[PDB]
Amino acid sequence: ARGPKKHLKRLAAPHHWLLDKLSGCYAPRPSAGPHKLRESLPLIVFLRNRLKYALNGREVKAILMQRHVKVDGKVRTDTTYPAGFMDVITLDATNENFRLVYDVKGRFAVHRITDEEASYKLGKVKKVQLGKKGVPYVVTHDGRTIRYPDPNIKVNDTVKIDLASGKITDFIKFDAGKLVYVTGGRNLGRIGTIVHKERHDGGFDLVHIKDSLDNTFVTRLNNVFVIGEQGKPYISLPKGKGIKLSIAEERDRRRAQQGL
Amino acid sequence: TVQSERAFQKQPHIFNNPKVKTSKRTKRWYKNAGLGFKTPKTAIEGSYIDKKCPFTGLVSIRGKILTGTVVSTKMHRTIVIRRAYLHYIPKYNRYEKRHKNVPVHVSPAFRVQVGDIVTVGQCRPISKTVRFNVVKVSAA
Amino acid sequence: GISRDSRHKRSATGAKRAQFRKKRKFELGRQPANTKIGAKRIHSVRTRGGNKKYRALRIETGNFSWASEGISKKTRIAGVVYHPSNNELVRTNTLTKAAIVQIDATPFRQWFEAHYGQTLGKKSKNAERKWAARAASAKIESSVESQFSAGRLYACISSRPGQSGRCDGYILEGEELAFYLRRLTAKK
RNA sequence: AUCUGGUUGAUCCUGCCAGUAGUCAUAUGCUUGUCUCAAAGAUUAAGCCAUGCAUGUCUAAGUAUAAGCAAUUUAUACAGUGAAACUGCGAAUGGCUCAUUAAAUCAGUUAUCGUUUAUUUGAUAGUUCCUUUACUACAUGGUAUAACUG
RNA sequence: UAAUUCUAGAGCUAAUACAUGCUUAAAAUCUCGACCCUUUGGAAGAGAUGUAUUUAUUAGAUAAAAAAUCAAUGUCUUCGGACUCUUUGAUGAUUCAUAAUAACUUUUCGAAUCGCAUGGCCUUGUGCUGGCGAUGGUUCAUUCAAAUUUCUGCCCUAUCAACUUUCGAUGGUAGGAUAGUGGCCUACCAUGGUUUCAACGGGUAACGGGGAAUAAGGGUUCGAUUCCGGAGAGGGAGCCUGAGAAACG
RNA sequence: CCGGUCGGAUUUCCAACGGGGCCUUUCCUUCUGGCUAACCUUGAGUCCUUGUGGCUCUUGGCGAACCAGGACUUUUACUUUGAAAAAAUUAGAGUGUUCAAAGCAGGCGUAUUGCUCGAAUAUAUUAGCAUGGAAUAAUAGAAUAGGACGUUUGGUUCUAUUUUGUUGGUUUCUAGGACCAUCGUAAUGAUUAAUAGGGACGGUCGGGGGCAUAACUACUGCGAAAGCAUUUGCCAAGGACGUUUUCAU
């Protein structure tokens, strides 16, 4: 090519959006924004393929232009604005508040939360540096920079952000035995706790995570998102709570539950 | 000997004040390479100047790590390494031998004759055909 | 134009390569600017991105630097004596990096008397109050003051003039000067 | 996970030539009533091309004295709508073909401590009349051209 | 003017077009130094300090204890001066981030723009303050990208056995050029680099992969063609505008 | 076996099949720090028959889990398990498109402003990355000992972390790097000798070959092959046998 690309074809669209392969020829292509391309979800896949409120594209623009939909206490009208992990989607004419978080089979789940949990947001720590005129800042996974932190924060920790003023309340370190979400790969959406973490110099470091039913697995370091101390998260988890169920176990658990 | 080239030779931005006097020879500068590698004795207290050395020059080491035997030392500050493997052919269920030569760079801290076996690490492009330089050595 | 591809050379084997695409704009060269001495002529070229470079077509002054004292003043330049790449730039007096020129020594000498009060070669009470302070740091190397009778120092250029536009540098000192002066008066 | 016809008067072999099924594999011959789904100028000539179309764009929010319209009216700077033109942005995406190209492309895999980046998202700017308020505007400096008339 | 999205002369008036150009807290610290009359002095006054550009030089600590010492001093003065005194980020790794000192520059940026609302305070002057948001702006991060690069992997052919190096082929040193590394190019020097584990040359009615037909198992033959990657716009070469093209509506 | 019963417990034992653990002359090779539980040290708190009982409080020895600096240590091939190999297509789970090829839908109530399940799973298929094992097949180590262990002793160096508040100007130790002789203990250190191969050694055999001077010829002789016939002597070569020689292709 010569410049940037601007169309996304239909079969090349990311799989966990679940667009059906016969309705059109192209998919929505997500704008450049806070979250990466194949790790996010536009506002048109939310408002017509999950909540079933709108039936077209022409209906979604009619919703967005009435200035209903906010993200993180700020109004958006970009019809493919890229909402990603841990974002808060506050409609107003229904008094519903949502939070983007992962399913267990690997999907973005519809999650309703309260009116008080929708005042804050976690975020991990991607780098910490010394800026111009000697002040330091910190970069989160969604790209917020925040100057003047505590000195005890290091990288791969987790901050808590107040969405009103854009500030920090407290923070969680990163060591053995913590509650951890997994945000990328194969064991995607499972919740467990840290056994220990071995390190390879000049390579990709591996953590070992134990479930609650005590079965273990291994992922790279960067697909690991700290949530809280053991038995106590800071957010409202979905049903199943990140427990991997074998396919044998979930036929008959659907069978015996089938009593309607 | 160390001044044979037609322009003056120095680790740049390393200043000697003649007004002061201190019984050191010259303020040499030297770094630690990383990855559990050990800077040799003859680099910290040696007297050569080389632009492209891992312990003295301005190159980094990152990327791969290889290993192989040295088969030609006929250039000035480069050698050639031979590497040997096998290759599997599925229909016949068997292996066949192959090889590839790589050229690397040799700092004058090391003394490498033919027949030895070195380990080498990767740096940014040094010449037309060079992307590695030696970081350890073990004899024959 | 001048392109910087490696697709026109031969392999490490000697095998002659093949014509693969047409010539791409993002591998280009421009023309070498030779930098004469004279009145100020500086032209601006436009680069990748919206940036800017200043080509110097001829200039005459600079901004040179005394290391051991730590003072950098603005002077004039006179002519090049030595260039280690080819000696067809000394016979034309271009201006590259690593070129060895001569400057006029006047504002360094005029600074030196103001800082110390001592001559080179051969009255308020504030002044000798602090001239007495800078007493031990008075003397310098012999072989560098020994050209203050002529006002022609020896200095090398450390800025690329074809890129940055300017032409600055630093004074030769005795360790480096011992090398070049043995090179200067023997290779001719 | 299968085989049958053909060498000699008669028999056992080596051995090949017919046969037998499949093809999202192209043409061609004779026929042809129904529902659903649908490839289609690639091969030969990356040969040549009549006519029409396929790239333009405005919000309460950069510039309106249209000799525009609406007139309708609180409005003597202007205020409703709104051609033409300057300025801003885009035209580098998309669509089509397979001629070149045999360590090249390309695949799975690394590196940038070796570099440029419109846009988007988040931070970020008391110091700049000669001055620390002395002549010389900050209740705000200067020309030039477009559409239009002739 | 036979003519084409061809255009000449004369006359008007605008801008987020083009060209200029003011405003503002206090603090500290440096250099210069009127004087002063003195010991061991202290001083009026003056100027300098945003950010960006280019060069030079310093800070960017850290493995375990105690004296003798040369003086100086913070201090109770014990007028002996014994002492009753230190901070420092990140990486496997840096000349890293970031800070200071001297300067330097055909001196970069630091809102002479637009819609809505219309209020609070008064000595009532069109006095003073004051809401929501559009567009622009320098640098660091970020997102969509881009440019190069590491390891292993291709069909037939010896009726192709030696190939490359003037005219860069393989390496060293210094410059030029570029967004940037690099023989990418130019100077001086060295004599290297590939090969029977098939180099180099010849054929291809050869764009590469995901994949397709047949199938006991192993395999044989295809892939111009709905997805991702490259190349091209009658054949070669050259450049303009732009963040981005060696672009062909 | 046991059922014991208003198929699931198993009081409870047996056969195998795989897994730990210690001990046997015998596996991580260690070091410094924290550091956490744990044995213990001066010794009681704690509360249970009263305790240096442990639990745990205090000083103090430690192994003991975790971080961090290490500290050194032959190298592969193969195999086991993991992360990471886009979707579409292929094998395939669920699901009355009226069946089917397809599709990813759909199902239930009052149908009266409703709740509700889905959109799985497998397919290393070379090269790279993380990890378990030590069979098979390679590779290195002490023979002129410059061999290994020593808290045998003489050395030569190089760093100053510390304290003589502090600062700079000196050197005294001290730790802390390497290298330098000789003095001590370990059982000091060399795989067999292939009905593999070579080399000697002793008595023989043959129309074998070179220089000089038929019959015996099949029943069988010799030579790598083509081939090789009168006696005598020289020059070297060779098989087999014999052997308690030698080298380790």
Next chain:
RNA sequence: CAGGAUCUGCUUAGAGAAGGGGGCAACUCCAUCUCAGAGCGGAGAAUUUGGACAAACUUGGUCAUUUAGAGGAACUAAAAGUC
């Protein structure tokens, strides 16, 4: 590397020198008839010096083809006379 058709803001003489006050009479006063002077500036077309990048052209020398005829020598038919 040069070149300067043409626009141009300027300083400043200065006589032309116009109308009010002052020998009121030109004139002289900032109370404006008609212009010759220069002083430093800026923007800039046609044309031209040396380069690198290079499409093409001419010329022979070599090959491959084609094509025109040209000269060839043979074998065979819902071909065939014979020694």
